[PDB]
């Protein structure tokens, strides 16, 4: 029979689709960030201050205020990450089947992948092991 090279064709399609999926989610994450850029800085500041200190009561109050102000946006992030992960796992299973069928077919010859026999080098090895086994017989 012939060889229509289906592995490499599906691999080309996959590798073209991979970077389009990701960037929508990356922009979604960038959009989520833009709310947390006047909350995370001063939160980190007040936390390290309280960690390395009559007023500490007001400080802890401020820290809880900022904490539960910033809580909602931290579930957005992991929701988006979960859908991103499921999409990329679909793409990865696609890719791996295409790859394994390319290798299982001969769209990559098995003398070009796993190299040559006896490879002008490797005479050193045969000499060494031959001597070991010889004086093992001696």
């Amino acid at each position: 029979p012939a060889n229509l090279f289906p592995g490499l064709n599906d691999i080309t399609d996959v590798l073209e689709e991979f970077p389009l999926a990701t960037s929508r989610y990356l922009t979604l994450l960038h959009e989520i960030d833009a709310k947390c850029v006047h909350s995370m800085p001063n939160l980190n500041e007040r936390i390290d201050k309280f960690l390395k200190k009559q007023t500490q009561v007001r400080l802890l109050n401020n820290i809880n205020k900022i904490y539960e102000e910033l809580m909602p946006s931290l579930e957005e992030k992991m929701h988006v990450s979960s859908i991103m992960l499921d999409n990329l796992d679909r793409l990865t299973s696609r890719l791996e089947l295409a790859y394994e069928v390319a290798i299982k077919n001969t769209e990559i010859p098995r003398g070009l992948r796993l190299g040559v026999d006896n490879h002008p080098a490797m005479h050193l090895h045969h000499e060494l092991m031959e001597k070991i086994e010889s004086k093992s017989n001696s």
Binding site: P1, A2, L4, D13, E16, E17
Partner: protein
């Protein structure tokens, strides 16, 4: 079919090429009806006359009225075959327009603003307090009155490749719209299906969703579903899930989830073409001048156009003459030749063409080179030894009766060549090349200053050896033009090299090759139209003399007209040697040959001479 791979087939021919055989009968009936062979012969005459796109459709049906109007069913058959619909209109009233300005004209202040008529058409606005009622105002309104432009110009028009880019933009925006809408409808349908899955088997059977479903702009989903199924069998489904959302919208959703996948892969497969199609088209759409001019003066440097130019000057001269204002015209076209070195420069290219050309035998190639050299030297009155030495020193630094080359007015400063078309054509070809080269040379000094002042893009010219050194830029243009004429350089490299190195101010040379191909073929046809040979002979006989009378000027005109028919025209090319002023007059046959009268007694002489023969 396992062993052999698959091949694309040539093509399937269109449908409207192989369906003809039912109508081949009617024409035998028509032949029988017309009876005679000659009437039928002129019938086929006009049929073929149409099939070669010579006359219209209504006029064709009128000519077939002259033939087969005698038969009503036959003529109606023919009428509907060619689709000649009845122009059943004699009672037609050209009706007025509904709009333009039925209502509005009153006290108008300034160019484009007029007062609104004072009437209680007052529509009350809500949000306005006193401030918004005093700053915003509604007495005056602006209406365009496109008042003559008091000017005149041409309108910009899009290059050919800009439009390809616009169409590509619109195609990909439409793909994106369809795929995004399909996704959003997938979302809404998924929410509904999830509401429907977890229920009891009797709150399903009675579930109904109203039109809209929760989409504030609902129509999209319907649209989407239409495009997925069709616009025939799509309303049926759009309604079948408006009355059974429990069983017929896990099927409409399983299919949107196929069409999303497929339509995105299709977008990818055609973005391959969209991508390969953009490197080529983008960069050649930023040069508007070098791409407009190319076609413009590829199709305007033809015989008809320049004749029409000079004859237009002639006709408006004479109709201004019909007006009493101006007395009368002297001549039509004016040329000045300040720099003469350019002449040899043109030869720098001229026979440089022929040394490469194959469409001529080398002997007659020597002959037309002789044409060019002797002709320039005799007409423009620069020594043949000068062109000799220019030729020799040229290939040094870049290292003979003309009749058989082809085969009282004292103090003669002016010399007139009374020529037919081909001579005029070849001459103004020469003149065009000369003036464009002189224009590209005048500023060559500051061009050298351009290329030097540019101190450190396109690296190709670097390795190519196509950059511009601080050398003589004008002579480098000469050299590169030679290069492309002989083929030392394909086109686009010449193009972008000249463009960036010199400026975008040198587009008028992007076609130099072609225009030289216009003077190595017209001069060759000069020596093969024997009548023009007689013309050039009479010219050189009249020119090699130093003194002659105006009567022999009339004689010259007479038997130079001898060789050209009554239909053909003549142009007189006067050349004055002091300033190399070359003027051209458009002469009709019987009227006077040369300069109009200054006083009246010189043409008392004209009268007696011209009527004396």
């Amino acid at each position: 079919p396992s062993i052999v791979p698959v091949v694309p087939e040539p093509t399937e021919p269109i449908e409207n090429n192989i369906s003809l055989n039912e109508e081949v009968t009617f024409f035998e009936k028509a032949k029988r009806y017309i009876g005679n062979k000659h009437l039928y012969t002129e019938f086929l005459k006009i049929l073929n006359l149409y099939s070669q796109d010579i006359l219209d459709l209504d006029d064709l049906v009128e000519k077939v009225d002259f033939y087969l109007g005698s038969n009503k069913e036959l003529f109606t058959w023919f009428k509907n075959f060619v689709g000649y619909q009845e122009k059943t209109k004699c009672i037609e009233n050209i009706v007025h327009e509904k709009h333009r300005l039925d209502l509005d004209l009153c006290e108008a202040f300034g160019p484009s603003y007029k007062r609104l008529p004072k009437s209680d058409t007052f529509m009350p606005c809500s949000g306005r307090d006193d401030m918004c009622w005093e700053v915003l105002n509604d007495e005056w309104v602006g209406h365009p009155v496109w008042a003559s432009e008091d000017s005149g110009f041409i309108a910009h028009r899009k290059n050919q490749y800009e439009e390809t880019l616009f169409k590509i933009e619109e195609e990909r925006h439409e793909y994106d719209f369809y795929i995004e809408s399909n996704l959003r409808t997938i979302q809404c349908l998924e929410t509904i299906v999830n509401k429907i899955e977890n229920m009891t088997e009797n709150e399903k059977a009675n579930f109904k969703l109203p039109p809209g479903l929760g989409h504030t702009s609902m129509t999209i989903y319907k649209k989407v579903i239409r495009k997925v199924y069709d616009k025939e069998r799509g309303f049926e489904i759009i309604d079948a899930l408006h009355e059974h959302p429990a069983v017929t919208a896990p099927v409409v959703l399983k299919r949107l989830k196929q069409k999303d996948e497929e339509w995105r892969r299709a977008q990818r497969e055609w973005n391959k073409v969209w991508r390969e199609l953009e490197q080529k088209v983008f960069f050649k759409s930023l040069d508007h001048l070098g791409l407009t001019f190319k076609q413009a003066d590829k199709k305007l440097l033809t015989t008809k156009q320049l004749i029409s130019e000079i004859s237009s000057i002639k006709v408006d001269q004479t109709n201004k003459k019909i007006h009493w204002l101006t007395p009368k015209p002297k001549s039509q076209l004016d040329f000045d030749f300040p720099d003469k070195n350019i002449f040899y420069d043109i030869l720098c290219l001229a026979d440089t063409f022929i040394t490469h050309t194959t469409a001529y035998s080398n002997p007659d190639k020597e002959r037309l080179k002789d044409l060019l050299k002797y002709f320039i030297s005799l007409f423009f009155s620069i020594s043949f030894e000068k062109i000799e030495e220019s030729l020799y020193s040229h290939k040094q630094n870049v290292s003979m009766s003309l009749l058989d080359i082809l085969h009282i007015i004292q103090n003669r400063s002016i010399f007139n060549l009374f020529a037919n078309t081909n001579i005029y054509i070849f001459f103004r070809h020469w003149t065009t090349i000369y003036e464009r080269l002189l224009e590209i040379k005048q500023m060559n000094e500051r061009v050298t200053k351009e290329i030097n002042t540019r101190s450190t893009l396109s690296s190709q010219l670097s390795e190519m050896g196509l950059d511009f050194v601080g050398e003589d830029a004008y002579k480098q243009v000469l050299r590169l033009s030679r290069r492309l004429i002989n083929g030392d350089l394909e086109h686009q490299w010449f193009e972008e090299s000249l463009r960036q190195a010199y400026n975008n101010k040198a587009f008028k040379l992007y076609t130099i090759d072609k225009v030289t191909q216009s003077l190595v073929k017209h001069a060759h046809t000069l020596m093969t139209d024997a009548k023009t040979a007689e013309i050039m002979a009479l010219f050189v006989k009249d020119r090699n003399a130093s003194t002659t009378s105006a009567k022999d000027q009339i004689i010259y005109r007479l038997q130079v007209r001898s060789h050209m028919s009554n239909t053909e025209n003549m142009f007189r090319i006067e050349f004055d040697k002091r300033t190399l002023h070359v003027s051209i007059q458009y002469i009709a046959l019987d009227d006077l040959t040369l300069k109009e009268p200054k006083a009246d007694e010189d043409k008392w002489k004209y009268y007696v001479t011209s009527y004396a023969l």
